[PDB]
């Protein structure tokens, strides 16, 4: 499942 | 310094009328929102900080606070739809698009990221990003003679955001937006970075998931051979979207399907139909079922490539949903193929694993298998060899299952079973 | 065009 959204950790 | 601030302290600094105080507070919010363990997105929203973050995006003389705000808003936009909506409601879309042309690569990259999250929410926010004019400045970032001169992280984010503009249906992206994006996408599909390649394949798989006209726009850009090459990659994150794209294309016309065959795709299917990843096997078998739904010369290519034994294989042993795609593959084959092609299917051993799947409780796979058996018997009638097929079905216990299904809840499993018993087992 | 084609199920 290719995630639509991406969180930036660092 | 800015580690582990309270939201209260962040609000205090952001509400100071001291740009440096606001910069430090904004960075502190960025660090809060950057943690993996439940970032307090809702608390930041409830404190009313999004309008101030958005206004900081426009502070051209304080590029650090543009970056920190962009990062903070990116991570709010990465959450639920409601959380993404709060970012959009604050006016962030035009402010991020304005940042695409920033002379600071890290700031324009963060604006790329944020728009990717907004567009990725759904077709409405995707189309709203498009209406604010995001496509032209995005593509201008990739207007270089050689993509390899761009920073790899930057190029990956651009590729991923472009694929979110290609993503989702009801409605599909605007036709003119797709035409505008496609030549850059074709170029990204030839780049050597595995992540760029994966996300480029995903973008193509979205664009081909639709009516035949959508498939044609992609197929006419000539990407099918490159997709087939990527079908053979060792990186599973590349094979998965490449196969989804190839399978999408063969849902189209016989002509579009033929270009997948022309490109040499069938030679990869011995591996794909035995691939250890069950979803690859399922997708590969579904693709095969749509190819065996094609012309007799396309069925013949399946034969020539030695792929009927591989279909016998997945029918004999696979995850159930792959076995059902294999059942469809046989029914499509027997519906459209010649008598000689259908006879070859029996010679490869399709009958016994076909009969064994009549034990399944899925009622429509029983319907699919019963139709294939009827199709094979019709070929056997043209040859006067109905009785050999009867005895073949008899010796593997298939007749017992056919007359058992005479006792079935569904009305057509009912009749198809009895009809086969009536005509071929008297 | 081809009615036997199937989408993902």
Nearest C-alpha in B relative to A3: B120
Could you tell me which chains touch chain C, where touching means 3 or more CB pairs under 8 A? B
Contacts of B253 in chain C (CB under 8 A): 1-2
Length of chain A: 10
Contacts of A10 in chain B (CB under 8 A): 34
Distance from CA of C3 to the nearest CA of B (A): 9
Q: Which of B67, B123, B121 is nearest to B96 (CA)?
A: B67
Q: Is B336 an 8 Å CB contact of chain C? A: yes
Q: Domain range for residue B38?
A: 1-426
Contacts of B335 in chain C (CB under 8 A): 4
- How many structural domains compose chain B? 1
Q: Say if CB B343 and CB B300 are below 8 A apart.
A: no
Contacts of C8 in chain B (CB under 8 A): 286
- CA B74 to each of CA B3, B70, B78, B287: distance values in angstroms, whole numbers, following the listed order: 19, 6, 6, 37
Resolution, given in Å to one decimal, reads 2.2
Quick one: tokens of B114? 């944020």
Q: Answer whether A4 sits within 8 Å of B75, measured CB to CB.
A: no
How was this structure determined? It was done by: X-ray
3-state secondary structure (DSSP) of residue C6: coil
Q: Is B252 an 8 Å CB contact of chain A? A: no
Of the partner residues B71, B79, B241, the one whose CB lies closest to the CB of residue A8: B71
Q: Answer whether B34 sits within 8 Å of A6, measured CB to CB.
A: no
Distance from CA of B117 to the nearest CA of A (A): 5
Q: Quick count: other Cβ atoms within 10 Å of Cβ B72? A: 30
Residues with Cβ < 8 Å from B219, sequence gap 6 or more? B208, B249, B252, B256, B259
Residues with Cβ < 8 Å from B4, sequence gap 6 or more? B31, B32
Task: Give contacts of B 97-136 with A, CB under 8 A.
Answer: 110, 113, 116-117, 120-121
Among all chains, which residue has been given the structure tokens 């040859």?
B383
């Amino acid at each position: 499942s290719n995630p639509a959204k991406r969180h930036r950790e660092d | 310094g800015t580690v582990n601030w309270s939201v209260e302290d962040i609000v205090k600094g952001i509400n100071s009328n001291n740009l440096e105080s606001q910069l430090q507070a904004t960075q502190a919010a960025r660090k809060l929102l950057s943690r993996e363990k439940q970032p307090p997105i809702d608390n930041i929203i409830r404190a009313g900080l999004i309008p101030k973050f958005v206004s900081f995006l426009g502070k051209t003389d304080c590029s650090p606070i543009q970056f920190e705000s962009a990062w903070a808003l990116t991570n709010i936009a990465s959450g639920t739809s409601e959380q993404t909506k709060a970012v959009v409601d604050g006016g962030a879309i035009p402010a991020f698009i304005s940042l695409l042309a920033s002379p600071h690569a890290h700031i324009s990259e963060q604006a790329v990221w944020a728009l990717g999250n907004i567009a990725g929410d759904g077709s409405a926010f995707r189309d709203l990003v498009i209406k604010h004019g995001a496509i032209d400045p995005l593509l201008a970032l990739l207007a270089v003679p050689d993509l390899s001169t761009l920073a790899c992280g930057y190029l990956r984010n651009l590729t991923w955001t472009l694929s979110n503009l290609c993503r989702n249906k009801n409605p599909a992206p605007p036709l003119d937006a797709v035409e505008q994006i496609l030549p850059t996408l074709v170029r990204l599909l030839h780049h050597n970075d595995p992540e760029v390649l994966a996300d480029s394949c995903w973008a193509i798989s979205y664009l081909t998931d639709g009516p035949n006209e959508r498939i044609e726009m992609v197929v006419k850009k000539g990407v099918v051979p490159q997709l087939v090459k990527l079908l053979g990659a060792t990186e599973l994150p590349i094979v998965t979207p490449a196969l989804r794209a190839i399978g999408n294309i063969v849902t189209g016309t016989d002509e579009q399907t033929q270009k997948v065959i022309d490109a040499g795709a069938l030679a990869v299917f011995p591996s794909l139909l035995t691939n250890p990843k069950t979803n690859i096997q399922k997708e590969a078998t579904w693709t095969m079922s749509n190819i065996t739904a094609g012309r007799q010369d396309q069925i013949q290519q399946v034969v020539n490539h030695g792929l009927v034994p591989f279909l016998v294989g997945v029918l004999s042993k696979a995850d159930f949903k792959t076995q059902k795609e294999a059942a469809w593959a046989i029914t499509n084959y027997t519906s459209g193929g010649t008598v000689e092609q259908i006879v070859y299917l029996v010679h490869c051993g399709i009958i016994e694993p076909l009969m064994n799947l009549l034990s399944a409780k899925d009622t429509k796979i029983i319907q699919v298998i019963l139709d294939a058996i009827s199709n094979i018997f019709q070929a056997a009638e043209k040859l006067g060899e109905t009785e050999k097929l009867s005895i073949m079905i008899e010796e593997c216990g298939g007749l017992d299952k056919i007359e058992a299904l005479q006792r079935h809840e569904n009305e057509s499993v009912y009749k198809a079973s009895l009809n086969l018993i009536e005509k071929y087992f008297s």
